[PDB]
Amino acid sequence: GRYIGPVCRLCRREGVKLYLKGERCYSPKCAMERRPYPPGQHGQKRARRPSDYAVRLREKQKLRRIYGISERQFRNLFEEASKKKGVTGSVFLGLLESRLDNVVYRLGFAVSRRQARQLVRHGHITVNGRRVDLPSYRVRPGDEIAVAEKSRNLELIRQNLEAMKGRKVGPWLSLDVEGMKGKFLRLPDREDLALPVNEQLVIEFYSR
Amino acid sequence: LTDPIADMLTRIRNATRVYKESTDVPASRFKEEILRILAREGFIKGYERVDVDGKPYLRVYLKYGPRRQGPDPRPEQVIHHIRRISKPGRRVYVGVKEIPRVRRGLGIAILSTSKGVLTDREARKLGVGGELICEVW
Amino acid sequence: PKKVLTGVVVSDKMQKTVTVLVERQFPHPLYGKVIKRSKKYLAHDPEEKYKLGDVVEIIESRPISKRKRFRVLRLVESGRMDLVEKYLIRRQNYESLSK
Amino acid sequence: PTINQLVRKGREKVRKKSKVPALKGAPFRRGVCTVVRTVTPKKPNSALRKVAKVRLTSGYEVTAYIPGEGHNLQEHSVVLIRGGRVKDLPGVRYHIVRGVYDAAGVKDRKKSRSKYGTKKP
Amino acid sequence: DFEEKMILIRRTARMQAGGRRFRFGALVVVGDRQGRVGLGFGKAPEVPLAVQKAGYYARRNMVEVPLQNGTIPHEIEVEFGASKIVLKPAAPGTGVIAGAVPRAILELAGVTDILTKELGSRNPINIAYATMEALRQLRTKADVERLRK
Amino acid sequence: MVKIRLARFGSKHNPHYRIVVTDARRKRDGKYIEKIGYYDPRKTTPDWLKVDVERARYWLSVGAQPTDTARRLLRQAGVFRQ
RNA sequence: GCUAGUUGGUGGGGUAAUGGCCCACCAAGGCGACGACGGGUAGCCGGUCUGAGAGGAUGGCCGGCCACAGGGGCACUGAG
RNA sequence: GAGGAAGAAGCCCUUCGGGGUGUAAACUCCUGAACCCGGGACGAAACCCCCGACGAGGGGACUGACGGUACCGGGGUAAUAGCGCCGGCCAACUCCGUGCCAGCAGCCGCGGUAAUACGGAGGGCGCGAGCGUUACCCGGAUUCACUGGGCGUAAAGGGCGUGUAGGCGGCCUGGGGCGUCCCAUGUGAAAGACCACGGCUCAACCGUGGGGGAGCGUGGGAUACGCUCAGGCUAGACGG
RNA sequence: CCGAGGGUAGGGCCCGUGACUGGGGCGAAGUCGUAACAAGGUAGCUGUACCGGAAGGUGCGGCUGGAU
């Protein structure tokens, strides 16, 4: 299904922080703040020159591991974005950002995309009233994302919305902490996402 | 001789590649139409009708760029490339929707259509097609 | 509509029948060059008006026999023995192609 | 060639040749071993490579390589063969599949077990 | 100053009484990703000296590369001693579709979207020279109209 | 004889019928002479029944015999209305 | 190189109907290097896979047409 | 799922100081696939009967294999992971064992006592209910080159003439309009491909609508070019 | 009368196989010589003819992809 093993080793391999854990990522004990070298026996040896294929593969793997999506789904989404009219990198980023689990992670109902996946799957999230239990559901502009009425009195949800009363969501989103409900206004822009990714490298990787 | 049009284009290419001022070609009306198209598009300065040994000839006046600085000071060309498309051994016809775009719009294609000898842009504006004579850029 | 072809009479040795050589042109499907092909048709000629060298028009018709599904519609021109000569020379050249 | 020459004669397509004709269009073939022996490779390699003479269901009789360390094949063993030549052995074009019919899997194999037909320990 | 990309390293040999003696050749491309690109081929008894000399030669031979929206103004086909390069503009999302040598040359020049193909001989040095020539022959519409009218 | 009937399309547990005019000996999902309407028995859509009234009138006028379900659907769409 | 019902004509038989489809007689024609004849292989198409395109390969399922119903031949009934 | 050690034990490596597996585990908190209880489908309104006139148009009833299934509500446990690869191409490296043996191999090639290439182990990379292998097709192969190749020495000019079919052909004027081009119209079924909308909680899948589309028939138009007919010219060719 | 099929006789083409016999490709070693690459120790190559264990030799003519 998905990757369910150790997750800081992914950050150490990619050489950058992929915020895949939530609170611990901003703590001093983040593994990228203590051992910023790749895992294994040879992580502290001098790095050799990366080939072009290595560079493009690492960039694509970074982008894929940020969202925790399998390679089959990732490639299907990429081909779909390439079919659409519009700059394929921006369209691909928008399609990735429209997944329900990512949307409820950004709205603040969860602290990590993994937790957002568990929230959506376990029937705690409703889109436009009806309950949706599929992380891959694609949110269209105007859709209302919210916590189920019987799930509002949940400790995890209560704490998550408490910790977000100060934090402000992106321009492409709206949140009502009192109303416990979100709103997807438009496709996110490429500048609105603080992604350590060059999408041209991903496109060139998939041209091979 | 088998291809007067290709022969004239070859005369122009050969004379241009040595930076001559003018070149002569045996006269004909179709050749005159092609030369008029070339002059209107700025690839040549012009052309005129003269007599050599009592025979009618067309004198074409070639045009070049400014002098260049360096190891090679020969001026750059205004006719970089000229090529015949339809040949006696293979005739090429295109409809109005098969009209090629040469050099993304910097080059031209010459067409023989029922409305006359036109540039590709001219033929597209008139919505007509025909034989493809040559491409120039 | 009934197909009308135009050709030249190259054989009139049968009774009430003329062989008509019809030529057609078409561009080559892949190489683009225009090429010529020819085909012979046996055509019904009940009154035996048309002879060697005649350029005539024939029209698709009800079967008159085997191999005979066209009828001579009208005469186009006469005195075209040169086309017949081309066909006969081409046929004669085959005798030297054997082994 | 000229356009007219191409019209007269055209361009000739390329016909490929099968390297595994004894398979007769199948991915695998069953056979019976008649001779099991060892052969020596060509220069520069030096070894004693284990091969079997196999009479197949398709009517041919071929030589097949036995991969892996140690085998239990002998005369009248039933085997499955697949395509793939052994470079340094003359005339050997097929591989015995380990773990099928009378060809046991490689004992004590720990890596790449889907090849060599060894169950998970 | 410019970004530096090392395209090729190789060791060549000559013979004398005693045996073979080696030399190193470095092909290096220098550019600022804004319209300037240059190529240099340096030979030296040692690799770092070869790279330094290649960069020094590259900085002394640059082309202006008339970019427009990250692509080239028109398609171009250029031959250099049995090597052939074909370049074609593309839409803003295409990316750079090229082999390693043309990709390095075009990326350091500021090209973000292009379609390329290598034909004939695929020798890296001659392919790089052909790419440089093709970039040298690029003309915009203003250039051609300043030339014709 | 010519009949006006229902040809099944869609997928398993999701039937979608086309009201078509065809020869009676053709198999029910085979080629038809022409298509005049469509029907969705589950009514999952605001417009789950459409009929070309003029064409159905023409085909009825020349001797096409509808089936019971087809006749019912044509009556609902108002083909026999006077 | 092939062809002797072979190619054409006249009359007839047969068919829902044209026709050497079949028969009798008369003429000597018909086809072929634009590849006849012979040998090998093959159900054909809408489509499918691949490919930048041009092209190449392919015709499982689904829709259309054809052929066959143990291997051959034949007719009856019938609108078929 | 969240938190969770300058970081336990085991295992591997070490320059003997330590390094890695690794927040990974353990451990605490949270959620609740499987399971349990209850409810419960759509797909089925016609033919049929009554009135009206066995018409049009109104009224009523019967009919479920799938199936107690999908689904809904209320309870509820921390709950399968494997396969290939790690010399270059090609992403991912160390130790031990062996010693041209055993073995690996798609190509180049590895192995003959210090093997990143064989076997095992620790570690790593790629995918993941899959991962590999064999067979076949297209691609890469511009390596049958129409788009888009060549023939002095790399494979490739016939030993040389003459010439049949065929292919190609100078300048000017008019007619035809066969090729060629344009316009309208018929056909190019459905499904599939594309675009938009829509139904299954998404998706696959499906529905609706729209647009394309080579070729072919028909009617009309154009005549620059090719063809064809006719009349001229002398720069090609031939003759004196 | 035609007629599936069966029978008889003579041909054409193709496939498998055969005592024996001819060459070909290959080989981390054998026997005989040393023809070619240097003017390769007789410049080489070449068509043809004859000859010799073998590479090859010689005659006649040709080429330089040899020299002077």
Ligand code: SF4
């Ligand atoms: S704590 Fe740091 S290293 Fe670990 S998953 Fe979060 S961002 Fe990555």
Ligand SMILES: [Mg+2]
């Ligand atoms: Mg031609």
Ligand SMILES: [Mg+2]
């Ligand atoms: Mg013909």
Ligand SMILES: [Mg+2]
């Ligand atoms: Mg014809």
Ligand SMILES: [Mg+2]
């Ligand atoms: Mg008759």
Ligand SMILES: [Mg+2]
């Ligand atoms: Mg013979």
Ligand SMILES: [Mg+2]
């Ligand atoms: Mg030529």
Ligand SMILES: [Mg+2]
């Ligand atoms: Mg070896």
Ligand SMILES: [Mg+2]
């Ligand atoms: Mg493995």
Ligand SMILES: [Mg+2]
């Ligand atoms: Mg070169």
Ligand SMILES: [Mg+2]
């Ligand atoms: Mg070249």
Ligand SMILES: [Mg+2]
């Ligand atoms: Mg090459």
Ligand SMILES: [Mg+2]
């Ligand atoms: Mg008879």
Ligand SMILES: [Mg+2]
């Ligand atoms: Mg007959």
Ligand SMILES: [Mg+2]
């Ligand atoms: Mg006959």
Ligand SMILES: [Mg+2]
């Ligand atoms: Mg088709």
